[PDB]
């Protein structure tokens, strides 16, 4: 199966439009998260491989009575007079942490993997030409020759860390585990799959909070890296400021010095620094003045953009309801200055209400003014399909009516007992029934004569031309509407544009409305 | 749905904006409270200075009686100084106080700094009309200072 | 007004923007620092615990040493927490010190408030671009959730927005619609798609006056692969000029093509043209569809 596996990638390209090409920079970008955390975390706190060198504190002995460089104990390391001295171990602890270090190595080949196959579809990427990916080997490589992002990926894959990032005994080499900020270089793969994953998403403000949540632990976390690097370059005790015995915030009384007390001091004055609470010791020394000034300003700064991109972030999770509220903030206080009859101003409060309760908002602004006019026509007849199925002048004629008509009809939601039509108005308007029930009635209210369901059309009489009896423009009854109603809205001028492009709906039109004009 | 249509139906908007916001406020703060006086009981009363107890001397200070009502007083006020972010309160001794701390502070960041944005953005559109007013006649003024 | 032609001139804004705003930071702690320094050798130094001095203990802690660099390092720290109102100094001891740092913590939350104001809105505006077009496509989503509309119809929505995102294809010619004159609107048109349109025939056979009157009427439209942007039975109201994608030119089975359409091809302007020769008027006379993405 060499030759297989041998030919397959011999003519294997990247379609960079999948699905699985997706899910393949959310592995990248787990790969890039591993690389940001533990490279940072492994080249400050290094006793995450393994501490490397012993801890060596002062023992007053019960026995012999004497003082004594024993190495220390959890008890030794709690109530600290003084910092422990770190006598180096010969084979630099890879005699006893080498489980340690062949996890943190194969977590370390894995990611480095996830780059070389990541670096192999980059090799072989397709890329658009017309609207259309090439999907031909020698395009691709050429492309990909012509694009610097060999450049990219070379920087991004040089393997100096696994010579000089870890502790060799025989050249007393201690390690130096920064050298995989050229992994760190990759940033782009990443930024690519969280814009497509913020696309693709059907909750995307919870995205937004999550993303913005794991940009906040980054930013704490690399800057306790950076506190503790500090802490341990002017070394460890030797003031109030820096973590040691003598801070007394970090090593208080009955609390014993370990890694995990060393991680969680720096994330917690990270923490206190960064959002500029500041309930942390004072810096003695000038450098640490230089650098918690810094770091402060840094903080403010950062974390000032932050939180303001958190604030807009759950502010515009009720943006509809706040939009809303604001209308009727400004239909409450036109009302009220304008001294309003209480009947209409409940009537106002009880249509906003029903508008609030079945969400029939004018939410069509949206596709209106983003999405193209066929991917428009598209929406709104499979939103109203079972509404427009059920209409005789679109499934009695040809769909191209329909395909014209179905961008020109808006929805408007009217209240119970409200006239649509009646006889002294006139029309400029057709409707066809959304939602809600109506009924033709006399001038009285009282007789009804026919109602109106679902799908029904009315208000064609007034704006179709009939020369035949003595209306014309008027409207020749009184519709009223029983409950709620939701009617699809059509202007004279768009049906007669229409009719005059379609003749056979404007023949069934005129002869429905002389038939019902004759009877009547 | 109550306090949407109790929003809706309201003659005074803003003001029931505020009073909701601040019930808001009372809540979580109260939550909190109630998380941090359960965290100092499962750590254990009195077992180092962060915890309510006799180490503390924020929660009981001299000539200072541990009732229940100072249980909950001084944790509505670790809550409010917390939340807040003011954090003038004794510093996390043990780590599970640190994570606590820690977490708790970034959630008092994050949604208190959503809440007091919308408390801002609720009394500035109580004079929305005044404000859109006065742009508009500094824009007719400038136009006429510089012309 | 070098600032402003700075701004003006400049290829990176927001980058000059944030500069600028670290520099007015800068000045004003160094200014307030001098004040702080200036107002605790006025007091004397070494007075009280508010004053620099050995008296203070944050100023000169044990083991540090008074020097020029000491004072300015300590009024610049002491200026930093006054004014970003952190506050983690000593407290004032006499009056005047007391009236000093209430004025200067208040001008502090003033003018500082103002400054991260105007930092916010300007690293909220290095992407502005990404935030219109996400609220956009939020409405989008929120209206198709609502609606019950089919996941193929929303998948489809959803993957011209990747199209538009990744080809950065958004219409973006409202900034030069709506500031710029259409003089330099038709020369900036007629710059960028000067390869589009040196392809058209009916450009470039005829009067440089008819492309100068027509490229700014022209409307870019993104259309997805399989999309039939013509068929015979919809009426024609408009023509297009391909400025990217292929296109066919199909029967109704979909199947047949007779000829492809590329970059630069002139189609749909049989509708729209008035010929009283055949039988169809302001009908398509074919079916074209989109191959791949076609702008
Ligand atoms: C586990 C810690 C167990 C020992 C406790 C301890 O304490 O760990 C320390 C530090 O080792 C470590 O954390 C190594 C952690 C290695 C983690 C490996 C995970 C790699 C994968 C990363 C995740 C990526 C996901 C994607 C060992 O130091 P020690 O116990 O030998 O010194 C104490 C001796 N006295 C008592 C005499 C003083
Ligand atoms: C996280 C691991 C939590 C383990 C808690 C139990 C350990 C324990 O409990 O063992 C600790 C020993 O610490 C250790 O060496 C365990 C190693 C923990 C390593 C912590 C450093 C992690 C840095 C990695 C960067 C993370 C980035 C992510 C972004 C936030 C003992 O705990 P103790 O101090 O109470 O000993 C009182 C006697
Ligand atoms: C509120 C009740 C205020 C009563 C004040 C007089 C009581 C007094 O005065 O009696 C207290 C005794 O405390 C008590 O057990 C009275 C019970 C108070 C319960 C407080 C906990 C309430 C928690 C309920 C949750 C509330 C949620 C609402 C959201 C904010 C003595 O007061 P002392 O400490 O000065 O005794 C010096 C000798
Ligand atoms: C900046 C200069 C940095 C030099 C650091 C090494 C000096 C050193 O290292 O020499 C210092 C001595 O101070 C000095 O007179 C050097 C003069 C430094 C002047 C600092 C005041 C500058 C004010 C100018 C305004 C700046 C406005 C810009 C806006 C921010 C000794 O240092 P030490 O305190 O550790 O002596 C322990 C024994
Ligand atoms: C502005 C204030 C600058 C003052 C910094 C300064 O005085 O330099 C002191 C440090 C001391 O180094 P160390 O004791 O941390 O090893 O020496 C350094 O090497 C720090 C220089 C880096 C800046
Ligand atoms: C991140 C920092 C995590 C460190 C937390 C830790 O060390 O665990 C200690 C607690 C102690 O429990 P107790 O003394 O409060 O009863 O033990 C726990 O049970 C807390 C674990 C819950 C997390
Ligand atoms: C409001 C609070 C005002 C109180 C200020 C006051 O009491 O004046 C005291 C200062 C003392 O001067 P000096 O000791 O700093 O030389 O005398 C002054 O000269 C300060 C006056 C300037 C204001
Ligand atoms: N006059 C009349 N109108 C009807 C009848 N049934 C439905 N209608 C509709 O009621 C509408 C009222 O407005 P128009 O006169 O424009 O058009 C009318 C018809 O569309 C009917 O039986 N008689
Ligand atoms: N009928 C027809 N149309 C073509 C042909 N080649 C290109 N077209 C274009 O396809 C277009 C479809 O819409 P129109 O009828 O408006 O205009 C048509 C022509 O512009 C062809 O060979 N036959």
Redesign the interface.
Known sequence: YAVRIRKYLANYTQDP?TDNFYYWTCVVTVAYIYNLLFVIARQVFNDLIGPSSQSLCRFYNGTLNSTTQVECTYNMLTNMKEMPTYSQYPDLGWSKYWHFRMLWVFFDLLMDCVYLIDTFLNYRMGY?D???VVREAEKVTKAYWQSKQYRIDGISLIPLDYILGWPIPYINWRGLPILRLNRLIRYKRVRNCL??T???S?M??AFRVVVV?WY?VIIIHWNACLYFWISEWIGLGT??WVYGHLNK?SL?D??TDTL??RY??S??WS??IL?????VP?????IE??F??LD??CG??I???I??????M???MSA??TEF??K??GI??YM?LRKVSKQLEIRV?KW??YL?TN?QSL??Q??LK???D??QA??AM??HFETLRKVRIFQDC???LL??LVLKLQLQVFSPGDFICKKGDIGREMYIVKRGRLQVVDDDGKKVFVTLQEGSVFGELSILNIAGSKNGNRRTANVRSVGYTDLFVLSKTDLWNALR?YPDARKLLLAKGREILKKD
Do not use: C, H
């Open positions: 439009s658009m017309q609207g259309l814009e497509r913020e696309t693709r059907s995307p403000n949540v906040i003031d109030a915030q208080p009955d609390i995990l007390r969680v001091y994330f917690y923490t206190l959002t500029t609470i500041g309930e004072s810096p003695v020394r000038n003045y230089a918690v000034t402060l300003m403010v700064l974390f000032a953009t939180v303001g991109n958190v604030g807009s759950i502010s515009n509809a309801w509220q604001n009727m903030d409450k206080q009220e409060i906003f209400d609030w969400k939410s069509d949206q596709v983003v999405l193209p066929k991917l598209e929406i499979q939103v040809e769909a191209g395909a014209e492009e």
